[PDB]
Amino acid sequence: YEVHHQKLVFFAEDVGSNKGAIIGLMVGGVV
Amino acid sequence: YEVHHQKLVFFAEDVGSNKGAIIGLMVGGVV
Amino acid sequence: YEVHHQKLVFFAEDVGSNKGAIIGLMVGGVV
Amino acid sequence: YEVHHQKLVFFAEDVGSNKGAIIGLMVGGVV
Amino acid sequence: YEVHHQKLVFFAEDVGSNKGAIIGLMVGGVV
Amino acid sequence: YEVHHQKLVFFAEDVGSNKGAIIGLMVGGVV
Amino acid sequence: YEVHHQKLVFFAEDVGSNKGAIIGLMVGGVV
Amino acid sequence: YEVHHQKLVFFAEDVGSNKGAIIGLMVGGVV
Amino acid sequence: YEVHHQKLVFFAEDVGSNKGAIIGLMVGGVV
Amino acid sequence: YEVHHQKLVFFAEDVGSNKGAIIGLMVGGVV
């Protein structure tokens, strides 16, 4: 898994109640 | 998995209750 | 898992009650 | 797990009561 | 787990009562 | 407005984020 | 507004973040 | 506003962050 | 505003951070 | 505002940080 040179902007203003995953970036795995 | 040079903008203003996944970027895996 | 040169900005202004994961960046694993 | 050269900014202004994980960055593991 | 050259800024202004984990950075482990 | 002898049962198990009104009973008015 | 003899049961188990009104009973008014 | 003989049961088990009104009973007014 | 003979039971087990009103009973007014 | 003969039970077990009003009973006014 070669992952590089990633300019990332993430906005999540108002979240009532997250019942799961909020991932800005995932290179791998299990969710 | 060669992943590079990614300019990403993500907006999620109001989220009541997320019952799953909110992924800005996923190079691989299981969700 | 080769992960490098990542300029990341993450905003989560108001969160009532998170019942899961809020990950700015995950290189791997289980969530 | 080779993880380097990561310029990261994380904002979480108001959080009522977090019932899970708020991770700025995770190189691996279980959550 | 090779983790280096990480410039990290973390903000958590007001937190009512955290019932979990608030991690600025996790190189590994169990949470 | 004569309203009487009302046996009422109301269930609302999981509500993500209510953006309006959840009224078990309204005898009148404006909503 | 004559309102009487009202046996009422109200359940709201899990609410992420209410952005409005949750009224078990309203005899009148403005909401 | 004649309001009487009201046997009321109200349950609100888990509330992340209420951004409005949770009223068991309102005889009148403005909300 | 005639309000009488009100047997009321109110439960609010866990509340992360209330950003509004939690009223067991309101005979009138402004909220 | 005639308010009488009110048998009231109120439970609020765990409250992280209340940012508003928790009123068992309000006969009137401004909140």
Residue numbers in the entry:
A (entry chain C), B (entry chain A), C (entry chain E), D (entry chain G), E (entry chain I), F (entry chain B), ...: 10 to 40
Authors' own words:
Alzheimer’s disease is the most common form of dementia and is neuropathologically defined by the presence of extracellular plaques containing Aβ in the brain parenchyma and intraneuronal neurofibrillary tangles containing phosphorylated tau. Peptides between 37 and 43 residues in length are generated, with those of 40 (Aβ40) and 42 (Aβ42) residues in length being the most abundant. These Aβ monomers tend to aggregate into insoluble fibrils, the structure of which has been extensively studied in vitro by cryogenic-electron microscopy (cryo-EM) and solid-state nuclear magnetic resonance spectroscopy, revealing a spectrum of different polymorphs. Two human fibril polymorphs have been determined: ‘type I filaments’, which are mostly associated with sporadic Alzheimer’s disease (SAD), and ‘type II filaments’, which are observed in familial Alzheimer’s disease (FAD) and other neurodegenerative disorders with amyloid brain pathology.
For the APP/PS1 mice, we observed only one fibril type made of two identical LS-shaped protofilaments related by a C2 symmetry. Murine type III fibrils were determined to a resolution of 3.5 Å and 3.3 Å for APP/PS1 and ARTE10 mice, respectively. The reconstructed density of ARTE10 murine type III shows only weak carboxy-terminal density; accordingly, an atomic model was built from residues G9–V40. The amino-terminal L-turn involves residues Y10–F19 and is mainly stabilized by one hydrophobic cluster composed of Y10, V12, L17, F10, L34 and V36. The S-turn, which involves residues F20–V40/A42, is stabilized by two hydrophobic clusters: in the first half of the S-turn between F20 and K28 involving A21, V24 and I31, and the C-terminal second half of the S-turn involving A30, I32, M35, V40 (and A42). The protofilament interface involving residues D23–K28 of murine type III fibrils is stabilized by symmetric salt bridges between D23 and K28 of the opposing subunits. The main chain trace of murine type III fibrils resembles one protofilament A–B pair of human Arctic Aβ-filaments.
